[PDB]
Amino acid sequence: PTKTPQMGTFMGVYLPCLQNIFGVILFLRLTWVVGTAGVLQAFAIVLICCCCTMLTAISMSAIATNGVVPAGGSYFMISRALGPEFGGAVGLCFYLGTTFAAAMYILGAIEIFLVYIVPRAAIFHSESAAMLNNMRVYGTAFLVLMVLVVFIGVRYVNKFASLFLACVIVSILAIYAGAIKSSFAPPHFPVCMLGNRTLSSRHIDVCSKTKEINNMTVPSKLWGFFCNSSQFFNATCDEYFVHNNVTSIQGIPGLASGIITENLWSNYLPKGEIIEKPSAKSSDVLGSLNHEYVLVDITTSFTLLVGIFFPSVTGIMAGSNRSGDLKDAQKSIPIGTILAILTTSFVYLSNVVLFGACIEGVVLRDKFGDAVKGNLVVGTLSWPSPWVIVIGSFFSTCGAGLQSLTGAPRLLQAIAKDNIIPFLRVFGHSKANGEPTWALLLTAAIAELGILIASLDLVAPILSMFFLMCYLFVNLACALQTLLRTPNWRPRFRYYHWALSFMGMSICLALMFISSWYYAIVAMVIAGMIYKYIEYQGAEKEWGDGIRGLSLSAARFALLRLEEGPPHTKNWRPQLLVLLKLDEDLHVKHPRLLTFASQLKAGKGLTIVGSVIVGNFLENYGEALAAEQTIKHLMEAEKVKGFCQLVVAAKLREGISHLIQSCGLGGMKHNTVVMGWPNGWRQSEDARAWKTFIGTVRVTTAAHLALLVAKNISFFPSNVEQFSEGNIDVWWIVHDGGMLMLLPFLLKQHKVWRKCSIRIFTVDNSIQMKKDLATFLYHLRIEAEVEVVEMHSNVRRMHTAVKLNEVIVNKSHEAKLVLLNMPGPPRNPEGDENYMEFLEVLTEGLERVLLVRGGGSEV
Amino acid sequence: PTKTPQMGTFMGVYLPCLQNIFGVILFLRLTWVVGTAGVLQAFAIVLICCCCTMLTAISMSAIATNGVVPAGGSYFMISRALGPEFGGAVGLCFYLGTTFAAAMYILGAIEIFLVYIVPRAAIFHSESAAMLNNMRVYGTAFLVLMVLVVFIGVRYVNKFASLFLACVIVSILAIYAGAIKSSFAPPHFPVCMLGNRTLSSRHIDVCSKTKEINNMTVPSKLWGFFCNSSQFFNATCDEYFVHNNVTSIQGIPGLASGIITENLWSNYLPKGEIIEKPSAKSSDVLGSLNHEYVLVDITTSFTLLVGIFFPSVTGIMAGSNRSGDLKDAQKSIPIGTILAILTTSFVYLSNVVLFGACIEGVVLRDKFGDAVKGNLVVGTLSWPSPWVIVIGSFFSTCGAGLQSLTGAPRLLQAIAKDNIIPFLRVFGHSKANGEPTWALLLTAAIAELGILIASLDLVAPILSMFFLMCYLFVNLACALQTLLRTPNWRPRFRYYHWALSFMGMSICLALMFISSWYYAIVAMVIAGMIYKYIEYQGAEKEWGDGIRGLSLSAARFALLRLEEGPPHTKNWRPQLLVLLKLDEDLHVKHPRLLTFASQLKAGKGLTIVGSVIVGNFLENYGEALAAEQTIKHLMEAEKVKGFCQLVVAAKLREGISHLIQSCGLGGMKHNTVVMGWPNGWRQSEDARAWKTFIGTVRVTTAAHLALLVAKNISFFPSNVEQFSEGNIDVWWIVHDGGMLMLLPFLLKQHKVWRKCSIRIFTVDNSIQMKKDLATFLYHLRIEAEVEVVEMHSNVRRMHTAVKLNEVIVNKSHEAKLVLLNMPGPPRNPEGDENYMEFLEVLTEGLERVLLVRGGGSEV
Ligand SMILES: *[C@@H]1O[C@H](CO)[C@@H](O[C@@H]2O[C@H](CO)[C@@H](O[C@@H]3O[C@H](CO)[C@@H](O)[C@H](O)[C@@H]3O)[C@H](O)[C@H]2NC(C)=O)[C@H](O)[C@H]1NC(C)=O
Numbered sequence A, B: 001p002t003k004t005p006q007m008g009t010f011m012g013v014y015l016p017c018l019q020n021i022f023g024v025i026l027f028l029r030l031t032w033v034v035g036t037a038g039v040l041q042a043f044a045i046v047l048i049c050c051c052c053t054m055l056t057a058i059s060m061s062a063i064a065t066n067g068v069v070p071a072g073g074s075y076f077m078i079s080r081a082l083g084p085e086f087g088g089a090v091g092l093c094f095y096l097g098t099t100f101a102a103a104m105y106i107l108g109a110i111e112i113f114l115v116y117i118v119p120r121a122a123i124f125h126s127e128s129a130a131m132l133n134n135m136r137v138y139g140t141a142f143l144v145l146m147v148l149v150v151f152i153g154v155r156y157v158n159k160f161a162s163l164f165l166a167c168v169i170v171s172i173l174a175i176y177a178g179a180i181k182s183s184f185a186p187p188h189f190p191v192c193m194l195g196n197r198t199l200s201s202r203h204i205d206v207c208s209k210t211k212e213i214n215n216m217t218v219p220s221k222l223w224g225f226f227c228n229s230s231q232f233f234n235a236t237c238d239e240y241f242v243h244n245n246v247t248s249i250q251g252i253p254g255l256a257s258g259i260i261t262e263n264l265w266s267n268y269l270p271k272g273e274i275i276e277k278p279s280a281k282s283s284d285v286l287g288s289l290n291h292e293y294v295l296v297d298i299t300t301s302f303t304l305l306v307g308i309f310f311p312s313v314t315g316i317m318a319g320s321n322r323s324g325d326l327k328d329a330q331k332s333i334p335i336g337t338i339l340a341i342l343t344t345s346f347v348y349l350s351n352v353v354l355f356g357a358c359i360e361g362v363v364l365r366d367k368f369g370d371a372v373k374g375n376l377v378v379g380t381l382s383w384p385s386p387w388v389i390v391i392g393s394f395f396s397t398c399g400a401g402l403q404s405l406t407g408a409p410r411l412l413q414a415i416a417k418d419n420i421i422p423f424l425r426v427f428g429h430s431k432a433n434g435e436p437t438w439a440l441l442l443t444a445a446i447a448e449l450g451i452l453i454a455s456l457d458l459v460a461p462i463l464s465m466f467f468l469m470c471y472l473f474v475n476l477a478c479a480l481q482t483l484l485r486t487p488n489w490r491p492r493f494r495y496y497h498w499a500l501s502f503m504g505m506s507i508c509l510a511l512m513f514i515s516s517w518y519y520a521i522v523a524m525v526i527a528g529m530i531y532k533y534i535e536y537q538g539a540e541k542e543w544g545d546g547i548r549g550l551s552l553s554a555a556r557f558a559l560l561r562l563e564e565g566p567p568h569t570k571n572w573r574p575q576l577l578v579l580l581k582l583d584e585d586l587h588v589k590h591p592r593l594l595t596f597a598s599q600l601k602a603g604k605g606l607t608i609v610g611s612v613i614v615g616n617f618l619e620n621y622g623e624a625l626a627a628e629q630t631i632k633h634l635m636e637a638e639k640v641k642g643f644c645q646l647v648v649a650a651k652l653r654e655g656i657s658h659l660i661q662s663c664g665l666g667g668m669k670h671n672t673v674v675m676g677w678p679n680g681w682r683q684s685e686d687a688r689a690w691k692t693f694i695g696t697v698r699v700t701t702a703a704h705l706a707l708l709v710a711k712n713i714s715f716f717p718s719n720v721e722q723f724s725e726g727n728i729d730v731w732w733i734v735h736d737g738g739m740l741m742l743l744p745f746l747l748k749q750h751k752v753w754r755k756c757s758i759r760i761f762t763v764d765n766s767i768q769m770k771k772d773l774a775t776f777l778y779h780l781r782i783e784a785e786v787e788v789v790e791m792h793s794n795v796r797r798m799h800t801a802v803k804l805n806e807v808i809v810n811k812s813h814e815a816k817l818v819l820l821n822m823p824g825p826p827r828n829p830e831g832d833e834n835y836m837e838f839l840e841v842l843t844e845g846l847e848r849v850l851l852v853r854g855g856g857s858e859v
């Protein structure tokens, strides 16, 4: 079944996008824009608009290539690629866009019918306000006719979309053929003009002051329109009429006439000034204000023209509105859409110059076909007659109204059916065939509200603002998801670079703000509220709570993004696991551990406090909760910011061995284990106490985590007291110098150890080390003095450990904190007593020792 | 030492804030603003500005009360309360504010000296541009004089701050005394006025056309300024002079004169229009343009006046610029600041009305004291003479320039010394006494750049924009931190409600945008870039990487915020721990477990995959890494989004018992354990396999987590196949109905089980349950059909289990998935074989069973 609807890029995405870009503006307003802007600035307008739409086409193609393309419309693709939040924001902004587009197209069909086809038939008789009322009443009647048609029989609309496109394309080819024929044989459309004041020709017949009748020089009607005598019997004619001259100016000069040089400059005359051709002669007298003087119909400006013109390039999201019936979506969609935009941009940029170079510089600024005997201005450039265009534009515009009144409610019911936003659930209701019955009424209501502003020139900025907001979000989600390395964002496109999407976002964000700085802020705040509300509803949906669940989702997303990345880090920073030992009273046997951990991390970073409770889990559940509360209160008391984890284990050694390798969620692991020294290991008769510490040392070294064994921790300073002056005597014995040097710094960054100095008692070869140590300190911009002491089984170890004792006390007996590198545990577990004796003698005579062992790739 | 500087709220925060709010604007521009705006709109201006500054005072007091107040300036308080990011953004915005304030005050001192004190002495001779050049050259000389003074001898500035405040206050009291005296005896300052055209009086002497000299009616000088004869010998006088009349209008009418009714309306005349008193008579002839006509000096508007006036209310952050020397900061600072703002607001609102009701409606719009013989306009309202004000304002304004050139570089070196932003490190360099030597040069450079725009009227909007951005960030950080329940945000204030800070943020965000929509966007983007760069640098500082560390910090902060909250949730949602069993080959023995977990959670939520590796950790480190990679590849293959944790344990039972209670970081815990059924427990000779499952059941029940034992999992559908039609036969046997009912729904929300139906085979009492079940389904808006089957040691259990088998197969033999409530494990571990036999018979004849046991507070 799918294969038959399979369509090549052309018939699948080119024609829908081509049929939806070609709107009414190209006819009813391109000539006016060219005239009041000058070909140069008109070129700037068309190019800037086409640039936003092209960069946005590139971003949307990047979205199209990423991942499998869902079978729904463009909304489903955008949703599945940018998350439901962006999906809903773009859905609603594009939907309001489509509704106000149905409003503009209905206004256009009414304007064409009323001004050009049948002027005589009007609700309000002959003045501007009357047109507005005529448009309001005529607009709603057509609006009601459109709603009823779309409600009953959309299949007929599907059938005649092709005829509508036919009408559009025939009209454009007629325009081009007329422009070409205007080189040798241009048409005979003349305009009466009085001096440099252009006259209307709806009522005048001859551009002559006196129309000879039956061999009698009776004054012509124009005399009757500038002089009230009408018989030239001592007629009182006004100043400008008597002074200046009426002339018949060829309204469409040849393509070779060279008028482009004349109309190459802006006019921008404000409301009610008479349109003046700055070529013909003129007197200077003034005061004779008359009705016949063609007037500037709106106080124009550049920023107004860009807004009036932008809704003619919107519609590229329709390229992928037929994405279910495609063969190679990620291959057909980008090329088809970009080619469609290139074609339409080529048409606009060619027609701008052709109008500039073929139509008089006065007939262009005429926004209602006056002075050309009431014919469509662009219609005058056509091969058969202006009638072909005046009817083709009307049929195309009513067809586009039907198209957008079928396309908007389907999108609304799809956004409702997705249950992204709850309150729109009412509009999810569908007809027997799945047509949105109760959404359509809302679309009609909003289109009604639009039509009430019965002027294209005032509806166009609103439509443009909504579509511009849609494009801005579509560009921003891609730029963001590319920068932040969002999961599942693989934009498999040969030309998509995040700078492109960012440049598009910036350009037509500027466009938004240019057109209106207050509508743009209103749109941005509406979109932000919808976005945050969708995020909140999703949180409440998945986690169960609003703000609790919001933070929960934030954490999960951060950890996932954190998972798909390089394991190492360019710098090494100690993330602690504090091993608190719980006594038989279930009280922390060493709070100084937490005090010191707090001082070491200085309240920032990750600190996981782990502890083992000896016993059976089946019956110590309550004790585990109580002891967890105890440790949490202790953490809060020592200003430790972090998390607590208790394991009720059968064996203390096994509990710690499981904590050391299972703590932390993946990606938020610790990398150092901070332990308390087993004070009084020899004193206790039981050998388990000292053997457990060794077991932990082996487990820590094997897991490749750093180890900081703090000894004599009962004498460690509390968070409230301070040191006036003291020396952190780092002993860089042998290797593992990175952690040893880095530690004291981190300690000195805290207020307790802030006021102390640092002395590295490194142990000719040392002098080689002296130069390296000096470089390390010179770079770190820290006040540190390095002194190099030249330094050169069990009996030998003791005989040398006593020398180490001698030197360390002789240099550092009165130090406030002695860091000290550690030796590894024995391979054979028999020599553990000898190993602990080595440590005890090595650390004898020291008030505060922090034994440190690297065992890792520390840099 | 601290006690002596202890100052009560008045002398500690009132006088610094009072001395820093009273600027130059109050003199040189309040009269002009009142005149060109009308007392009404001037009142609107003063009230709106004072409203932003008052709500911001409330927010800053809320900041002041929260936590301990650091000893530094306001920057340190703001930093320690809003994080270094907001601290740095506000610091730089307020610093640029202070520099451009030094620029405005130097411009003001020059303007006062040059226009009012010594007009004759000017660099450029007599025209507007000449004043600008005079101001540029004069400004830099004073600027260089100020820099040298501040560089050498700030102690003298500290000494004379009191004299500067004295000058300000004496001036304001002189203004009020003059206003009062103007009730009975107003002063004699007359103005010559020709018709309704006001004349300048710098050069005229008598307001008379002819000045009689020596009994001869020679024409007066004004004749020479409107007629070139100067001898009235057939003098050719212009039109307006001959038609209209010169009159002497009292320039300061009495307070009782009632002119307020006259000057109660806006003027807003654009540049160069002659200032006209709309009271006196006038002819209508025009054309006689003359030099003497006093002209509107700037194309005024409301939005311009608000910008010109705002830099007179800035300075409230100086209230807490002396926070180290206070007694009760959180008590003195709020009251002192708010009282200071009330005092100054009271002064402005009184002087607006007094000027409205005492000065002619023409002398006010005169921005350079013309027509009053070149005297300060407000100076004319004073008891002794205008000289007292003209000198007091000059001394006050040079004093404020010195004050802001000492206050800006100190703040800059403090922001540098904090090492928040790296590249500013160069400016951290200080003098011997700690004065910023190399920061001051930059402050002077920026002040120089400001002075180059030699006009207060153009510097004031920039200053106002910077201070407005500072206040907006100070309000937004408080509103945000109050809403999101940010840790350590305890605003102990009796009147602070987040709606107040939000209203302040909105009001003067509107102020920002009103004054300039392009400067405001430039300021916002600058602040956003500084904020994100500070955040990035902090990330790189603490975690070691830029983007890795950024996501790491985001995760830690989310979990912490997640920690201080209610433990339960209004809704229950299953967060899974999938227990994968690793075989002797270290391969996942049941991938269907992951398949089903993926289907159950549907890719959203938290899924922690735990598994135990039997062995010793010291030597299976490599195996643990390999098996972790294996399980990660498996997770990615089954579209499971989540984390993996392996524990190398000595006993499989103990490894699982430790995983069940230690998985997840605090706050991101699981709440359900998903296990695979021990298929073939009887077949295996070893009893360990079945006994371990029971051990896990007891541990799961005791930990109060839900349990989902999936049986016959080898037949569970894969993620690619689907079910055309089928029945999820939920058996709500007895209790724990919330989880049982909730599960199938979550399953049906996935595409695999999307196309299946649901049948609840609940087991008169049931009919009571029928009504409850119907209500539960009616609310959930899900298509579900409920059928109620009426239903009524070891031998009895088997004799009834076979009945359960009979019924369940008779109803559901051909079901696609049979959910089934579970019975608890025996209390005595001897009956475990009987317990497992009960389960096996109860589940006999079923292709797919999901045994479910609640054991928790599920709602
Ligand atoms: C149609 O003819 C009228 C009749 O003069 C044109 O009006 C006048 O055009 C001049 C341009 O030369 C405008 O500027 C004037 O320029 C002279 C040059 O010296 C200067 O002396 C004047 O003071 C003035 O600036 C003038 O404002 C304008 N109106 C009047 C009342 O003179 C009109 O511009 C012609 N149409 C077009 C499209 O040019």
Ligand SMILES: *[C@@H]1O[C@H](CO)[C@@H](O[C@@H]2O[C@H](CO)[C@@H](O[C@@H]3O[C@H](CO)[C@@H](O)[C@H](O)[C@@H]3O)[C@H](O)[C@H]2NC(C)=O)[C@H](O)[C@H]1NC(C)=O
Pocket (backbone or CB within 6 Å): B196, B276, B277, B278, B282, B283, B284, B285, B286
């Ligand atoms: C100072 O005196 C001059 C001399 O007339 C005033 O100029 C003229 O004031 C009138 C206000 O009445 C302006 O509006 C005119 O109103 C009449 C009312 O019918 C209307 O017929 C006119 O068409 C016009 O709209 C007028 O524009 C203005 N200028 C001229 C050239 O007449 C001037 O307003 C006086 N100063 C003040 C502060 O009022």
Ligand SMILES: *[C@@H]1O[C@H](CO)[C@@H](O)[C@H](O)[C@H]1NC(C)=O
Pocket (backbone or CB within 6 Å): A195, A243, A244, A245, A281, A282, A283
């Ligand atoms: C009107 O026409 C006459 C003769 O055709 C010519 O001399 C005159 O200059 C024209 N008027 C103007 C304003 O050029």
Ligand SMILES: *[C@@H]1O[C@H](CO)[C@@H](O)[C@H](O)[C@H]1NC(C)=O
Pocket (backbone or CB within 6 Å): B195, B243, B244, B245, B281, B282, B283
């Ligand atoms: C000028 O003064 C004369 C007499 O003092 C008076 O009649 C005339 O109305 C005055 N001019 C105007 C414009 O009122």
